[PDB]
Amino acid sequence: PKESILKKLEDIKPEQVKKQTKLFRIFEPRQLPVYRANGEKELRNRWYWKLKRDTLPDGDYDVREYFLNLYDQVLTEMPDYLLLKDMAVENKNSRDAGKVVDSETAAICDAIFQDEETEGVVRRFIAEMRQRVQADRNVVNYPSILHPIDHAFNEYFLQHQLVEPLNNDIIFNYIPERIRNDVNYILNMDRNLPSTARYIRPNLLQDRLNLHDNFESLWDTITTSNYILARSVVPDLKELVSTEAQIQKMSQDLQLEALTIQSETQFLTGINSQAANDCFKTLIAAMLSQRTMSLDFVTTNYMSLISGMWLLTVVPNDMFIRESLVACQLAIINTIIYPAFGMQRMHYRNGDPQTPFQIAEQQIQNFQVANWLHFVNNNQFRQVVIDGVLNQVLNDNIRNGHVVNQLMEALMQLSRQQFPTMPVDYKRSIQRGILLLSNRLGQLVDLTRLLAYNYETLMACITMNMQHVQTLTTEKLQLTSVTSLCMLIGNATVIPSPQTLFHYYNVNVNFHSNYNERINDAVAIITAANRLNLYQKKMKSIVEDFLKRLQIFDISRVPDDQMYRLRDRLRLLPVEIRRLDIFNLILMNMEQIERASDKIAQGVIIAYRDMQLERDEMYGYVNIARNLDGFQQINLEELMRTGDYAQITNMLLNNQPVALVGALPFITDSSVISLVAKLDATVFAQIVKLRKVDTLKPILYKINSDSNDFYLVANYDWVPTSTTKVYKQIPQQFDFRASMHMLTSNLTFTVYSDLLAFVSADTVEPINAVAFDNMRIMNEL
Amino acid sequence: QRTMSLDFVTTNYMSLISGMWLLTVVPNDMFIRESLVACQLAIINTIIYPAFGMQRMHYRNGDPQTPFQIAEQQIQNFQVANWLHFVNNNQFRQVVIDGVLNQVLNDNIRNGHVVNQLMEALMQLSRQQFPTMPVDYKRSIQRGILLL
Amino acid sequence: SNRLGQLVDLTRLLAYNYETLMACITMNMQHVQTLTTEKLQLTSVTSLC
Amino acid sequence: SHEDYLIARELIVLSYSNRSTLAKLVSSPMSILVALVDINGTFITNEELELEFSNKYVRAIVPDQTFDELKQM
Amino acid sequence: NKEESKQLLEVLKTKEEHQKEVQYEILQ
Lengths: 781, 148, 49, 73, 28
Description:
part of a larger assembly, 5 chains, A: alpha/beta, 3-stranded antiparallel beta sheet, 3-stranded mixed beta sheet, 28 helices, 40% helix, elongated, D: alpha+beta, two-stranded antiparallel sheet, 4 helices, 2 strands, RNA-directed RNA polymerase (chain D), Rotavirus_VP2 (chain A), RNA-binding (chain A)
């Protein structure tokens, strides 16, 4: 399970850069006929704007879902850059052998040149429409033929495409300031990058959700993920002092002899490599990921208690978990400190607000230990915002290691005391146990400086702010794993390679970018759904997808409540500029798309008065209406939420004028005999019997010479009068000149996703490695 | 006039001891700025300043000024300062001969005379301690300098 | 604390079904302490909650 | 197991005739295969000769032409 | 056989792409 998490993290590819090959379109021209007024038909035909892919459902709720789906299409298509030359094509009728942006645009231009029934002006316009360039600026202007909404979307994708000019300075500036300013690293590159180049910037916007505020199940997983990632980049302690010889110094100083190699209970039992490395890895990874770590030790082993002092000094106490260090401090006080002044053991209480070192700092009267314990109790992190990110920083006294001198002062004092209450052998054992640390003093100092340096160096490669909050699950830390580290160490510096840093930084960047981008997705759909009145829509599967695209969770064991709270927070986030503009371009044109689409209609008027039909021209005479004024209206989605067919039934039985509003199908009837027979009034009797309104299909009375009974109109002097008009708009007329636009773009750029691959990096020899204070680390011998 | 870059490992300080000769005789605008700056910076942080006892540096890689151009002012020693002065002003010179442009040298390089100043400076660096430094790596550097 | 809106929804649902079924009662719903008594396991609330 | 049966029937019938180009052959590609396995979790050894695990991940930067070699094998 | 063999040769090219290589290749 553990290794899988890192497999998922390091397989987080960045957000795949988009580049479209064609243009987003909703509309297309289409030849229909034209019927001159009085109804009869021209020999000539005419182009009109119609919709590609009439797929609009019935009912208003389903239509608003459709426009949400359209928003989803446009977002999924929404690119990051584009080069128009790669999609451009020839124009087969251009004077200058020019080009145009899309194949369908070219098809239109090459189809209108061939028709008999096209003006000469458009043919001239086709001869004179061509591409143009200006190469000093690397800018191109291509023709295009585009519906205005299509032009709006495409023009937004042109003007708001996310790229940034790439140079050799920005490569450096992508690295943190500390690494550039750290003299232990040397950087260079073997390429100069032109101004023709480009690069995309990640979205490194900090946590909009505050998952460290009562999303503990997610924060536990996140913190665990970052911890285990940090374990894969903390260096292994490549070089050590020996184990057998060191243990022989322990067994020749302490006279537990012979063959205490095998007998293992006192001052020993976890001296090995395999814990020293664990502690070295764990401390740094925990402080970086901000993960609390619990302690599993034994009280018989007093060297563990002694090396816990060093631990509780160099590391803050608010970083651990409470009961463990309470036990450890209590133990230390009861058997190293208070017996060193003839004080009582202690009388500690389980649920006490203060830890033993606090309430012990004031009791005993010794300067050294008092100021040591003062430091310990008041040791804590320093919050500070640097490069935008919050950071938990060490004291700046731990870093330039002098805390260990206060520690040695205290321990030497305790050596100088007597233990009156206790025998000589016990004191002898303890005092030898702390002389064994005194003899390792300089190495401890060096270790402290080395941990601080590696910690800040790896802190540099972090993008998400690092909060100090306790967690559900912990990481075990045997105190023998400190004692090992404190006893197996010396004259062996380990500096993280620059490549590990770049790897870790790019991983965190990619996780953070994925996080923000998917947040923006979810926020976009939530805001859009809430502004389109979608009330039957359960906003869960979207959040399930959101958590699935973050490749660290287990959706099998996350509930609905966390999802809905996460949604409640996501409601309150501003939508990014791209998505917001595309949505406000859709709220102002969803109706204009919905006025089109000859498969549904926006209503039907029912006024029992023999009213006139309208002289349109793509049709002839029609029972169409385009204003919906006068008569009172009834919304059908209202009627289908709360079924109350009392009003409408009352209104139909009494032949009362009314309008019905909602996406309604329709069927064209080109029979004049269906006009005088009045079949469109025959459709509303099924609404009073079977109160459903779903199989409701009003009539459209399109009349023209293609109707087989039109001759009556041209023989009997009657304008078509009728009843029960339909509320519907007409298609728009295709103006070739006015539909033409010029699309601008950049000429021939190149997009580079990774940005540090051009950097080659090297380390100074780690013996001569230096900290903030311009003073060497790992120098005591 | 093919720009060429440098690619090294700073642990092999002999490579840098030869690179300083290179930067002395070969101009600096021929080397891409990033690798040149890296080489100079490795030289300073490894050889020069720990020979004298300064703090290492804090260089800003987006600086129009160059590490040797700081060392020309921060060092108090006439030998290396005049060497560094030469290096900072070791650029090609534009001349027009027979109708072709030409990138010529400073005429203390066409004859070998500036290397005398280099080795005087280097002998001085050899004769100096490296106060903070250890001893095996110090004797090794001093003898590696006395080689050249 | 995280089931807030969920428990609001539950409570309204409960009260709605209770009052709607109260409408379909004739005999006066009178409050009396009874001899025997239905056992309610609070786990079966912990389930529901 | 089944794969054991496959291996055994496929070696037993060829080891009756081939006795010079069988173990030498099939045991040779393995040297390339080791350069294809991503490390996820590691064991280390000190100069002082002690194991010490590492969560280090390492990819497998295998060139292209060794695959052609492997295919010939 | 050999159609599937050549496709096996091919799928070990597209896969396991290094990032520095594609950067220098776009430049080159």
